[PDB]
Amino acid sequence: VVGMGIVMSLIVLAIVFGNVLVITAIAKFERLQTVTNYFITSLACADLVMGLAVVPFGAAHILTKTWTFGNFWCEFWTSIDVLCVTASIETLCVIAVDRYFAITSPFKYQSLLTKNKARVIILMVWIVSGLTSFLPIQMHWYRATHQEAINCYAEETCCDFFTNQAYAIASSIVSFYVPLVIMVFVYSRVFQEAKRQLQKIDKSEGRFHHKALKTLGIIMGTFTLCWLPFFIVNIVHVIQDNLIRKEVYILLNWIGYVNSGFNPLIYCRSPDFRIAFQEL
Amino acid sequence: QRNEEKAQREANKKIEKQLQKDKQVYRATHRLLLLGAGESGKSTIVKQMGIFETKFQVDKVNFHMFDVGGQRDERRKWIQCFNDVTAIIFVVASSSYNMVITNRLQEALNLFKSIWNNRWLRTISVILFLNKQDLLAEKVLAGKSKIEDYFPEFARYTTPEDATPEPGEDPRVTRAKYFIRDEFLRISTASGDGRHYCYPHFTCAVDTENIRRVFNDCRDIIQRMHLRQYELL
Amino acid sequence: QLRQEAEQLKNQIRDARKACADATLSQITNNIDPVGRIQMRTRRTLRGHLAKIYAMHWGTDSRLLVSASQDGKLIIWDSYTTNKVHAIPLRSSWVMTCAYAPSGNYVACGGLDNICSIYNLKTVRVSRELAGHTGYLSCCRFLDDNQIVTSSGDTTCALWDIETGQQTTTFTGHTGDVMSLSLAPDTRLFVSGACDASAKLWDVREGMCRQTFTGHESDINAICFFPNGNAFATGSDDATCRLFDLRADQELMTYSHDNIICGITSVSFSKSGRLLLAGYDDFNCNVWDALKADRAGVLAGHDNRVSCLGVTDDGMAVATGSWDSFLKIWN
Amino acid sequence: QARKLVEQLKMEANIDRIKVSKAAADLMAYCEAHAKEDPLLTPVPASENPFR
Numbered sequence: 001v002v003g004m005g006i007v008m009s010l011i012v013l014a015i016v017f018g019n020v021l022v023i024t025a026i027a028k029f030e031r032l033q034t035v036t037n038y039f040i041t042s043l044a045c046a047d048l049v050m051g052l053a054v055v056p057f058g059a060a061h062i063l064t065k066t067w068t069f070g071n072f073w074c075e076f077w078t079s080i081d082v083l084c085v086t087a088s089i090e091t092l093c094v095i096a097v098d099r100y101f102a103i104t105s106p107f108k109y110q111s112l113l114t115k116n117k118a119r120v121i122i123l124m125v126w127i128v129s130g131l132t133s134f135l136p137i138q139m140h141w142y143r144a145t146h147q148e149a150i151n152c153y154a155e156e157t158c159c160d161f162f163t164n165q166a167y168a169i170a171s172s173i174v175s176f177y178v179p180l181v182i183m184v185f186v187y188s189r190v191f192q193e194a195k196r197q198l199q200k201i202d203k204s205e206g207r208f209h210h211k212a213l214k215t216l217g218i219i220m221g222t223f224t225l226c227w228l229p230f231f232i233v234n235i236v237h238v239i240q241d242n243l244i245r246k247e248v249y250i251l252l253n254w255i256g257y258v259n260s261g262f263n264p265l266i267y268c269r270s271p272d273f274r275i276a277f278q279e280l
Numbered sequence: 281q282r283n284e285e286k287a288q289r290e291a292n293k294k295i296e297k298q299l300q301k302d303k304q305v306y307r308a309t310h311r312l313l314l315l316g317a318g319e320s321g322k323s324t325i326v327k328q329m330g331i332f333e334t335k336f337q338v339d340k341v342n343f344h345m346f347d348v349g350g351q352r353d354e355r356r357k358w359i360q361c362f363n364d365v366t367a368i369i370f371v372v373a374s375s376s377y378n379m380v381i382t383n384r385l386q387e388a389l390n391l392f393k394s395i396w397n398n399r400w401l402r403t404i405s406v407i408l409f410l411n412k413q414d415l416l417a418e419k420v421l422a423g424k425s426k427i428e429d430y431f432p433e434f435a436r437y438t439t440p441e442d443a444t445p446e447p448g449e450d451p452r453v454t455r456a457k458y459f460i461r462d463e464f465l466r467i468s469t470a471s472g473d474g475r476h477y478c479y480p481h482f483t484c485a486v487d488t489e490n491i492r493r494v495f496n497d498c499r500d501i502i503q504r505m506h507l508r509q510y511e512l513l
Numbered sequence: 514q515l516r517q518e519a520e521q522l523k524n525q526i527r528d529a530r531k532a533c534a535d536a537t538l539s540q541i542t543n544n545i546d547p548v549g550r551i552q553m554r555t556r557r558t559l560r561g562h563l564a565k566i567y568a569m570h571w572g573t574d575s576r577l578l579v580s581a582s583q584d585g586k587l588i589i590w591d592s593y594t595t596n597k598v599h600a601i602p603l604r605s606s607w608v609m610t611c612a613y614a615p616s617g618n619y620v621a622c623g624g625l626d627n628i629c630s631i632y633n634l635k636t637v638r639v640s641r642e643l644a645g646h647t648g649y650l651s652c653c654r655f656l657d658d659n660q661i662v663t664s665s666g667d668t669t670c671a672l673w674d675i676e677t678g679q680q681t682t683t684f685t686g687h688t689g690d691v692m693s694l695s696l697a698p699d700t701r702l703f704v705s706g707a708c709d710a711s712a713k714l715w716d717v718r719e720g721m722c723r724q725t726f727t728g729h730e731s732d733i734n735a736i737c738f739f740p741n742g743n744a745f746a747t748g749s750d751d752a753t754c755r756l757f758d759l760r761a762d763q764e765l766m767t768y769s770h771d772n773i774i775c776g777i778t779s780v781s782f783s784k785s786g787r788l789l790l791a792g793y794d795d796f797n798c799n800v801w802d803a804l805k806a807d808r809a810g811v812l813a814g815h816d817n818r819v820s821c822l823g824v825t826d827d828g829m830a831v832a833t834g835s836w837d838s839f840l841k842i843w844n
Numbered sequence: 845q846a847r848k849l850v851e852q853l854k855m856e857a858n859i860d861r862i863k864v865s866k867a868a869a870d871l872m873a874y875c876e877a878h879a880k881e882d883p884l885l886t887p888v889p890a891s892e893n894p895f896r
């Protein structure tokens with residue numbers, strides 16, 4: 001337990017530093033303010049909120065093995081967890097669809113995406129995440145019914161997660177399983193277009209004269225490896241009881257959290273962004 | 281007092297609204313620059329489809345062409361203004377290898393090399409039209425003139441394996457056409473690396489497929505730019 | 514025959530120039546106190562242009578100014594409150610210069626259409642079109658309410674009559690494109706720098722060339738009179754500036770640095786004639802010392818190449834324009 | 845065309861020229877005399893600055 005605090009103190013610092021740097025670099029310089037960069041700001045805001053108001057309280061609760069903040073703060077913390085996770089995941093699908101539209105139809109891309117439409121889309125995404133998280137949890141439509149659930153809800157010092165079979169399925173479907181297929185289809189089409197363009201170039205100037213695969217592999221693999229096992233066990237532990245332990249659940253959930261710190265290292269590797277970072 | 285301030289604010293609001301309205305029209309049009317050597321056929325190719333500008337629409341897309349013919353200086357100090365165009369159209373008469381006017385193709389090649397290697401024009405692609413195909417075929421069929429007299433390297437040149445000659449093409453006319461196209465592509469490929477490319481076409485004065493060719497080339501140009509921006513290409 | 518006589522005359526001129534160089538400006542100004550450190554901060558930023566900017570001219574009242582952009586617009590600002598006053602749409606989208614009349618009644622324009630156009634502000638509509646040049650316009654300046662001097666790319670300059678649209682006189686002698694000009698304070702002479710690395714001192718009343726200076730090594734992009742009227746400065750694309758004297762008829766000082774390799778797009782003096790502000794291709798502006806040739810400040814608030822630069826008549830502010838479609842007022 | 849150039853050089857050859865020291869002294873005197881009324885040289889108080 002001595003080194004656990006040391007290792008968990010670095011995650012908060014990394015998340016906060018990366019997201020603060022990204023937000024400050026976007027806000028300070030006018031040349032970086034485009035339509036595409038609006039979604040990155042929302043993703044950074046969600047990751048920053050997760051790094052600030054989620055990781056420290058969870059780490060303290062794990063270390064002390066007791067929730068010393070009554071019963072209101074446990075529910076508020078759970079609502080914030082769900083809200084931040086959903087709002088972070090949906091922005092990746094938004095960005096993927098944006099790139100799909102930008103590459104597949106280049107003539108109509110300028111007219112399709114505007115500042116007002118981007119703002120409307122971001123507001124809709126955040127509203128949907130809030131409806132998924134805050135509305136059911138605070139209205140007590142997610143609690144379970146077994147004796148252990150009642151006992152843990154009664155205790156003020158105990159704050160554990162118990163849900164009914166329908167809520168887990170609905171939340172997993174809304175948060176993870178719907179964006180995944182959309183992103184897979186989008187990136188398949190993008191890879192096809194890139195391959196076609198490369199073939200045309202080679203057929204044109206082949207006599208005188210890998211990147212897409214690596215980029216797509218990074219983008220898909222990071223997200224899938226970070227968030228896939230948790231949303232499998234989230235249904236496994238309700239379908240088949242007495243099959244999933246608590247420590248495994250916590251470990252997979254925390255593996256999911258650290259994906260919020262890797263985001264600035266994937267969506268902000270641009271010469272303009274690097275120059276902006278250097279100027280700071 | 282505030283009486284002048286209110287009128288100033290109203291005028292500023294009206295001007296800003298007009299500018300916002302005009303920005304949408306400005307951002308959804310494509311500008312093209314038309315260049316060519318002397319007697320190459322710029323006027324004939326533009327009529328079929330200080331300064332001269334034409335506007336045409338294909339597939340509900342707005343296009344806007346320019347033809348700078350008012351200035352005929354050997355140097356081009358006005359070439360730095362056209363550093364934000366979609367593409368450049370270069371027209372050359374490929375059937376003028378025996379006109380002294382160094383012959384004409386040498387001057388055209390030098391002009392193409394100078395345009396390609398320019399500080400401001402380092403991210404603009406070129407659509408290349410090799411005009412006057414029928415005259416080139418007629419010259420090749422006749423034995424009066426030989427290309428090796430003016431271009432010695434043609435003697436050791438051989439037709440590339442990847443070719444698409446039409447049924448009416450003789451083995452010699454195809455060889456000459458591909459020799460000239462390769463002569464241009466050799467200069468094209470050496471200088472740039474991924475930033476901008478060249479699109480060569482064989483054109484005469486009776487075909488009416490040039491608008492489709494420009495449309496497809498511009499679509500490819502924008503698609504490649506977007507692919508390269510995201511590091512997918 | 515004639516060529517030998519021309520060479521002999523050139524040698525005689527060169528020998529005559531060398532006999533009058535008793536001392537140097539750098540030697541005389543050794544004991545004067547240095548200007549020190551000068552720092553300028555942006556006060557206003559103007560937005561509204563959809564494309565890059567080439568031209569800008571201050572008003573006589575030191576409050577209004579005009580600007581021209583590639584999108585085909587001509588906007589008049591109010592630097593005190595940042596309020597757009599006018600927006601004139603242009604027939605041709607390729608504009609390269611603009612000017613603002615001394616009385617504020619009219620504004621001129623020109624570009625790649627080989628035509629100079631005058632607009633009546635206090636009537637906005639086109640008032641007169643001047644044609645006859647066979648090359649793109651590079652500059653235009655108002656002598657008074659009824660006269661204007663223009664230069665074009667056909668190696669000639671002309672003096673126009675707006676009322677009738679006729680060239681009163683024409684100036685010839687350059688072997689390259691004329692790139693800029695500037696009028697004397699009393700409006701009796703003017704200078705023009707061309708693309709053959711030479712500048713000449715013309716006479717408006719007579720119509721003849723009086724002096725020629727050939728100190729540079731490449732194209733000349735900018736020119737500006739000293740406030741006194743007995744000197745001027747030029748800026749070429751070889752990253753050098755030079756100060757010429759009319760009476761001594763030779764170069765006095767050179768403003769160059771070893772860390773600058775980019776070209777110069779515009780120059781301008783100050784109210785007292787002590788500072789010299791020059792814009793460069795490396796996205797920033799440098800401030801020199803006229804009597805020392807020592808750099809004394811840098812203005813680095815732009816994100817693209819600086820194309821124009823101007824100082825107000827009262828010497829209260831400096832305006833700059835760039836290719837990112839933004840103007841900035843420094844103080 | 846050569847005759848015109850010869851005439852131009854002949855006209856330009858006969859011009860009086862003054863000492864470089866005199867011109868430098870005149871420029872220095874003008875700069876020194878008009879140094880007080882230069883808002884860009886000596887910064888102006890913020891009371892009389894219309895841009896701030």
Ligand SMILES: Nc1nc2c(ncn2[C@@H]2O[C@H](COP(=O)(O)OP(=O)(O)OP(=O)(O)O)[C@@H](O)[C@H]2O)c(=O)[nH]1
Nearest residue numbers: 316317318319320321322323324412414484485486
């Ligand atoms: N026989 C034949 N002549 C052609 C063909 N294409 C172009 N031409 C020549 O083109 C000429 C028509 O004038 P343009 O092609 O516009 O030449 P231009 O007006 O001088 O154009 P620029 O030199 O670029 O300014 C005719 O006299 C033809 O000789 C062709 O396919 N067949």
Ligand SMILES: CN[C@@H]1CCc2c(ccc(O)c2O)[C@H]1O
Nearest residue numbers: 081082085161168171172175253
């Ligand atoms: C306690 N951590 C929570 C538990 C369940 C859950 C999470 C995230 C998104 C969801 O849709 C969920 O249902 C996890 O972050």
